[PDB]
UniProtKB/Swiss-Prot annotation:
Belongs to the UPF0398 family. HAMAP family: UPF0398. The lineage of its organism: Bacteria, Bacillati, Bacillota, Bacilli, Bacillales. It comes from the Bacteria. SUPFAM superfamilies: MCP/YpsA-like. This is UPF0398 protein YpsA.
Amino acid sequence: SLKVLAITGYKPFELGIFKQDDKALYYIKKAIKNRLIAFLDEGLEWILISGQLGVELWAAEAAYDLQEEYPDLKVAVITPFYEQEKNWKEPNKEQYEAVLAQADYEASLTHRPYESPLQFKQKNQFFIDKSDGLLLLYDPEKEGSPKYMLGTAEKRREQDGYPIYFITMDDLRVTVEE
């Protein structure tokens, strides 16, 4: 049973999305909320993100818009290290802070700022190990930043059938027409 869902996906630059304005962002969030609704009616308790800009924060925001009708849905933000938002633009810092302020749980796997790629590696392994499945907004042709975490998920799938779910560019098209 899928109680804890990890969610990741593209950073804003990968999609060319720089304002919450924003046409495709409406459809991205709608696609996320529609997946979550389905998971919720199959016993979803927790979503888990690391606080990454783009899809991770947008997924938390989507979950927060659903908690009124699904008050048992909880959001955990577990960061790989401290102050990951330190060099982001002010509006992005604010977006991040708003998400962390509202999370049911939040912690950092290491009690220090960014030190080495090892903190990302360890965080990804933790997320895969401690969740029941992974949802990605990710496209296999484009590839990009989420491929790394996907790989770690696929290594678990190979072993125990850990389910992986995608919102591809084709999925976003279907979201638009419906």
